[PDB]
């Protein structure tokens, strides 16, 4: 509603795992063909059509935008799960939280190695862009030495 | 699943073992490079000891 | 006079005079922002004149809205507009915009921001207006005389264990 | 039934009642025993598809209200010590505090065998506790 009216929105989901569970429950109750982990074959299409609605509209369309921050939980760092794989492949990057770092005291517990933003540095401000250009390399060197 | 996570943690432990062994390799290599100069300085002290 | 094509080569409407008139007729600069949004929706990208008119509306407007809004700042709004114009539209601000910013800083009494804008105008534009510079200096001297040169808790002396970290 | 008793003691009286349960996993197991017979396809690991809703209804009923308060303590069985099982995974989100036990810790002679790393609590914030 705001995006088409030249304004910027931030939609947070907590969380897609339970939505997938609910869709699975509905399909199995309605006697629909299941698939891997009994999730039907429409789960990927469901998530794709949910997330693709987040976009940066062109200047002639209003200039509005929608940002998507879905949340996903992995059991014992099992990132190979069907839903997690689908959502990771769909999204434009991921932020990975690590229990080890969280317990160690790094709060937030972001794991830079496992976290990425496919968009890149084009979304950073000029000053932030310049600072990050060196900060990223510095952190890489520190990790290599550690 | 349970067996999958068993194998996964086995792999993680092996990777940790590999990293530790790599670190000790680096340490011993540094020590070896430091001590290698003895070759150019040896074989001329025990002349009259013979 | 000359057609402008969008990112994909489609032309755009360069006639922005009605929107400029609407902006000048607005009351609260949030309405001017809404007008800019409507222009973007209608494919009439704002121009330098439109941005300067928006800045004038901000300067001459009573407040952000009919009802008070906490921590509102005309200076912050105008700086955000300038960033949007320069970075996301590739349009260099003119001296009129900087003069409006300096006028707003002087009216607010923010002598430090006035100094910074004066330096920016000297660097990019052809100097800062003498009247505005003198007004900023007078405001700074008045604050110094009255004792409001700097905050109070900053001047307050605190030891290592005295800082009351909340 | 026990939850209804506790709800009465909470609302019609206005008490701070304790509610101990051992073990909740049997509820889900029993429902799974009859899912297929009722005519519902198995979903995952063999558990019934309606596990999430079935457990959520009960967990939500188990809560403190304005009238009274309920302090609930539930034992949870993890098959084969596999925490990834859907029933424990769902149960994790319907709790304020979780105490995870480890067979290795028990074997090491430590009792209670509690893994603080995997343990968690909501009130572990400076505002609430010292």
UniProtKB/Swiss-Prot annotation, chain A:
Belongs to the ATPase alpha/beta chains family. This is ATP synthase subunit alpha, mitochondrial. Disruption phenotype: RNAi-mediated knockdown of the protein in procyclic, insect stage cells impairs assembly of the F(1) component and slows the proliferation rate of procyclic cells that are cultivated in vitro, both in the presence and in the absence of glucose in the growth medium. ATP synthesis by oxidative phosphorylation is dramatically reduced in procyclic cells. It is found in: Mitochondrion; Mitochondrion inner membrane. It comes from Trypanosoma brucei brucei. The record marks 115 as: Required for activity. Mitochondrial membrane ATP synthase (F(1)F(o) ATP synthase) produces ATP from ADP in the presence of a proton gradient across the membrane which is generated by electron transport complexes of the respiratory chain. F-type ATPases consist of two structural domains, F(1) - containing the extramembraneous catalytic core, and F(o) - containing the membrane proton channel, linked together by a central stalk and a peripheral stalk. During catalysis, ATP synthesis in the catalytic domain of F(1) is coupled via a rotary mechanism of the central stalk subunits to proton translocation. F-type ATPases have 2 components, F(1) - the catalytic core - and F(o) - the membrane proton channel. F(1) has five subunits: alpha(3), beta(3), gamma(1), delta(1), epsilon(1), plus the additional subunit P18 (Tb427.05.1710) that is not present in F(1)F(o) ATP synthase from metazoa. Subunit P18 (Tb927.5.1710) interacts with the alpha subunit with a 1:1 stoichiometry; the interaction is direct. Subunit gamma is part of the central stalk. F(o) has three main subunits: a, b and c.
Swiss-Prot record, chain C:
F-type ATPases have 2 components, F(1) - the catalytic core - and F(o) - the membrane proton channel. F(1) has five subunits: alpha(3), beta(3), gamma(1), delta(1), epsilon(1), plus the additional subunit P18 (Tb427.05.1710) that is not present in F(1)F(o) ATP synthase from metazoa. Subunit P18 (Tb927.5.1710) interacts with the alpha subunit with a 1:1 stoichiometry; the interaction is direct. Subunit gamma is part of the central stalk. F(o) has three main subunits: a, b and c. It is found in: Mitochondrion; Mitochondrion inner membrane. GO terms for biological process: ATP biosynthetic process; proton transmembrane transport. InterPro entries: TPR-like_helical_dom_sf. Keywords: ATP synthesis, CF(1), Hydrogen ion transport, Ion transport, Membrane, Mitochondrion, Mitochondrion inner membrane, Repeat, Transit peptide, Transport. Disruption phenotype: RNAi-mediated knockdown of the protein impairs assembly of the F(1) component and slows the proliferation rate of procyclic cells that are cultivated in vitro in the presence of glucose. RNAi-mediated knockdown of the protein also slows the proliferation rate of the bloodstream form of the parasite, despite the fact that the organism can profit from blood glucose as source of energy. Mitochondrial membrane potential is dramatically reduced in the bloodstream form that relies on ATP hydrolysis to maintain mitochondrial membrane potential. It comes from Trypanosoma brucei brucei. This is ATP synthase subunit p18, mitochondrial. The lineage of its organism: Eukaryota, Discoba, Euglenozoa, Kinetoplastea, Metakinetoplastina. It is a peripheral membrane protein. PPR repeats lie at residues 14-48, 53-87, 94-124. GO terms for cellular component: mitochondrial inner membrane; proton-transporting ATP synthase complex.
From Swiss-Prot, chain D:
Belongs to the ATPase alpha/beta chains family. It is found in: Mitochondrion; Mitochondrion inner membrane. This is ATP synthase subunit beta, mitochondrial. Mitochondrial membrane ATP synthase (F(1)F(o) ATP synthase) produces ATP from ADP in the presence of a proton gradient across the membrane which is generated by electron transport complexes of the respiratory chain. F-type ATPases consist of two structural domains, F(1) - containing the extramembraneous catalytic core, and F(o) - containing the membrane proton channel, linked together by a central stalk and a peripheral stalk. During catalysis, ATP synthesis in the catalytic domain of F(1) is coupled via a rotary mechanism of the central stalk subunits to proton translocation. GO terms for molecular function: ATP binding; ATP hydrolysis activity; proton-transporting ATP synthase activity, rotational mechanism. F-type ATPases have 2 components, F(1) - the catalytic core - and F(o) - the membrane proton channel. F(1) has five subunits: alpha(3), beta(3), gamma(1), delta(1), epsilon(1), plus the additional subunit P18 (Tb427.05.1710) that is not present in F(1)F(o) ATP synthase from metazoa. Subunit P18 (Tb927.5.1710) interacts with the alpha subunit with a 1:1 stoichiometry; the interaction is direct. Subunit gamma is part of the central stalk. F(o) has three main subunits: a, b and c. GO terms for biological process: proton motive force-driven mitochondrial ATP synthesis. It comes from the Eukaryota. Keywords: ATP synthesis, ATP-binding, CF(1), Hydrogen ion transport, Ion transport, Membrane, Mitochondrion, Mitochondrion inner membrane, Nucleotide-binding, Transit peptide, Translocase, Transport. Its main location: mitochondrion. GO terms for cellular component: mitochondrial inner membrane; proton-transporting ATP synthase complex. It comes from Trypanosoma brucei brucei.
């Amino acid at each position: 509603y705001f995006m088409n009216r030249g304004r910027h929105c931030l939609c947070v989901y907590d969380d897609l795992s339970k939505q997938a569970v609910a869709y699975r429950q509905i399909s199995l109750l309605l006697r629909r063909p299941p698939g891997r982990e009994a999730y039907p074959g429409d789960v990927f299409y469901l998530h794709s059509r949910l997330l693709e609605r987040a976009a940066m509209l062109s200047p002639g369309k209003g200039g509005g935008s929608v940002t998507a921050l879905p949340i996903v939980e992995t059991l014992s760092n099992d990132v190979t799960a069907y839903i997690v794989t689908n959502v990771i492949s769909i999204t434009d990057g991921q932020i990975y939280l690590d229990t080890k770092l969280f317990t160690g005291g790094q709060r937030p517990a972001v794991n830079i190695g496992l976290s990425v933003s496919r968009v890149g540095s084009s979304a950073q401000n000029a000053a932030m862009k310049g600072v990050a250009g060196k900060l990223k390399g510095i952190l890489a060197e520190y990790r290599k030495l550690a | 699943s349970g067996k999958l996570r068993l194998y996964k943690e086995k792999l993680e432990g092996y990777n940790r073992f590999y990293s530790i062994v790599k670190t000790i390799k680096m340490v011993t290599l540094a020590k070896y490079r430091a001590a290698q100069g003895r070759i150019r300085t040896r074989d001329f002290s025990l002349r009259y000891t013979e | 006079a000359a057609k402008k094509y969008d990112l994909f080569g489609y032309e755009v409407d360069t006639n922005t005079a009605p929107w400029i008139e609407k902006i000048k007729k607005c009351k609260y600069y949030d309405e001017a922002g809404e007008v800019l949004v409507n222009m973007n929706v209608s494919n009439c990208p704002p121009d330098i004149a439109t941005y300067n008119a928006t800045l004038q509306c901000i300067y001459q407007s009573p407040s952000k809205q009919s009802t008070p809004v906490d921590n509102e700042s005309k200076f912050c709004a105008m700086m955000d507009l300038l960033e949007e114009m320069q970075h996301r539209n590739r349009l260099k601000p003119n001296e009129e915009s900087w003069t409006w910013v300096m006028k707003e800083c002087v009216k607010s009494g923010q002598f430090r921001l006035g100094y910074c804008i004066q330096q920016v105008m000297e660097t990019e534009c052809k100097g800062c207006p003498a009247d505005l510079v003198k007004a900023n200096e007078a405001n700074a001297q008045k604050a110094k005389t009255e004792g409001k040169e700097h905050p109070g808790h900053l001047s307050q002396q605190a030891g290592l264990f005295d800082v009351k970290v909340e | 039934s026990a939850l209804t008793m506790a709800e009465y003691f909470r609302d019609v009286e206005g008490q701070d009642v304790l509610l101990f349960i051992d073990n909740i996993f049997r509820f889900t197991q029993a429902n799974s025993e009859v899912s297929a017979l009722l005519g519902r396809i198995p979903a995952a690991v063999g558990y019934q598809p309606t596990l999430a809703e079935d457990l959520g209804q009960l967990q939500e009923r188990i809560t403190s209200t304005t009238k009274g308060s309920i302090t609930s303590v539930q034992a949870v069985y993890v098959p084969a010590d596999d925490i990834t099982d859907p029933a424990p995974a769902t149960t994790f989100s319907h709790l304020d505090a979780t105490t995870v036990l480890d067979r290795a810790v028990a074997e090491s002679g430590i009792y209670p065998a509690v893994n603080p790393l995997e343990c968690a609590s909501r009130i572990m914030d400076p505002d609430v506790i010292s």
